């Protein structure tokens, strides 16, 4: 009801009907419509006709270009200030601070950024009132996970960016059918705005609308709401990926008893016809997508991909830890992808793929550093800054965090159970990061408690994913440091509690390091497809083969236990060298980190493993 006509937005709907929306869905749409004041309201249906109209619209607006060399591939160049996640401006709103982060013993919490409701209300009222003036508010109904899976969650994202809508059609399952499955059930509320209401006060760079000064990515897990403003790039705008499927999902997983982790899922088959599934948690820009799509160099071995970034795991009635990929596509880093490193990715991104901030060749193709592919004579390269680029310049032709957005079903080695609603049984979990020194190539945990300690003690040199710089070894426990949704001490206690469940079939826990260098700064391990030799040893350990050797840090492969045939130049002494001087300093850094960041919320079982490791190292 109303006294005038200022609340009924039915006259602004250009596709769909507010009358056909569920009541709680319509309240969420009309409520924010009155606040953001959009010129139009577009209810997405996920059809090919709608996807084609948005591509044509963005091309006419100068947002995206058509890559004429491939089949339905598009290039988008963004503002140089809006190129990655902004971890510093990502906050979690809870009534009590201890719900979000463990109260630090002295320093500042590196495990999350908390903000009170009172402070966020002021930051919200200074950004969103009238932010969509003259723009179209798109309503995106999407489902994370197979539409029908028990662990499937439905979300509604409001946004004023057609680039977000197009990307969400690739990365999630979006359409009219998601609204039918929702009904009057619960959904996650997602609100996004680029923060450029018309008329524009500031001219846009590369026709990319963004507001870097007022960028804010807020999470309210008690309200099931995600509110993002100012950014339209990747993890900031695609609210169903990092904000939903990791931060909010980890909170829900703790409440409901499952797991939401920053892990890939791959299935590997041996020449004897046995197939196992593995999960691996690597930090951002550390090799997850390359591992999940690996072309193995060992004959008779095959790798199939279930997912490359996010995993939702939960025990079943039989005690098996089952995992699903809640995503629908791949949002992977472009630089470094070549026919040598990731040939299965090259086959995937040749059609129906949206590229962001990669270089364009004059014949209509893509180009980036590490592509390992020469060009034809007369072919010129246009950098991501929309400028002419020659190999003589200092700057790279593609941004380090440039991405491709391709459907998962196009991957030639996609696992036939990647859309199965029951999930795949995980028999192994892999941790690791970028360590240039000290950490051996691979080792195996001694128990479930030691394995949880291994994940909590993860460290890796700073990459180019967030906004950190410099060669600095930083802590990244479970590769979840920028994505924790609640107290990290309670996160560890949730992982340790898995060993208390009846009939539980706990997987083995391994730690790898593809990035160990020698004294020359050269990589000691070739990596990429050669990592199948490391996965071969894991496969045998899960079966129970006697190919392990006990060390002060865990189980390492025996002498002549790794298939190193063909790589006769590998320095096995330096690949598995365990220096006591290095590990005395390493445990000191882990002790100082866990004591300050977790403090009174640290489970005793984690402190016991820290004591045990330091004792075994002292006896060396
Ligand atoms: N030396 C070495 N480098 C690798 C290996 N695998 C991947 N890399 C490099 O590490 C970078 C990380 O690539 P990704 O697999 O996309 O990183 P990611 O873990 O998926 O990170 P996100 O996509 O942000 O979640 C790539 O650009 C590769 O160049 C490897 O086995 N050995
Ligand atoms: O940061 C990561 O690990 C990503 O996968 C990229 S984004 O989706 O967070 O932009
Ligand atoms: Mn126009
Ligand atoms: Mn990731
Ligand atoms: Mn990836």
Swiss-Prot record:
It catalyses: oxaloacetate + GTP = phosphoenolpyruvate + GDP + CO2; L-seryl-[protein] + GTP = O-phospho-L-seryl-[protein] + GDP + H(+). Binds 1 Mn(2+) ion per subunit. The active site is at 286. Keywords: Acetylation, Cytoplasm, Decarboxylase, Endoplasmic reticulum, Gluconeogenesis, GTP-binding, Kinase, Lyase, Manganese, Metal-binding, Nucleotide-binding, Phosphoprotein, Transferase, Ubl conjugation. Induction: Regulated by cAMP, dexamethasone, glucagon and by insulin. Dexamthasone, glucagon and cAMP increase levels, insulin decreases levels. It is found in: Cytoplasm, Cytosol; Endoplasmic reticulum. The modification Phosphothreonine is found at residue 176. One of its GO terms (molecular function) is magnesium ion binding. PROSITE patterns: PEPCK_GTP (PS00505). Residues 455-485 are annotated as: Omega-loop. Mn(2+) binds at residues 242, 262, 309. It holds the Pfam family PEPCK_GTP. Pathway: Carbohydrate biosynthesis; gluconeogenesis. Acetylated. Lysine acetylation by p300/EP300 is increased on high glucose conditions and promotes ubiquitination by UBR5; acetylation is enhanced in the presence of BAG6. Deacetylated by SIRT2. Deacetylation of Lys-89 is carried out by SIRT1 and depends on PCK1 phosphorylation levels. Phosphoenolpyruvate carboxykinase activity is regulated by acetylation and glucose levels. The anaplerotic conversion of phosphoenolpyruvate to oxaloacetate is improved by PCK1 acetylation on Lys-89 (K91ac), Lys-471 (K473ac) and Lys-519 (K521ac). High glucose concentrations favor PCK1 anaplerotic activity by triggering acetylation on Lys-89 (K91ac). At low glucose levels, SIRT1-mediated deacetylation of Lys-89 promotes the cataplerotic conversion of oxaloacetate to phosphoenolpyruvate. Phosphoenolpyruvate carboxykinase activity is inhibited by 3-mercaptopicolinate. GTP binds at residues 285-290, 403, 434, 528-531. The modification N6-acetyllysine is found at residues 68-69, 89, 471, 519, 522, 592. The modification Phosphoserine is found at residues 17, 88, 116, 284. GO terms for cellular component: cytoplasm; cytosol; endoplasmic reticulum; mitochondrion. Monomer. In eukaryotes there are two isozymes: a cytoplasmic one and a mitochondrial one. Belongs to the phosphoenolpyruvate carboxykinase [GTP] family. This is Phosphoenolpyruvate carboxykinase, cytosolic [GTP].
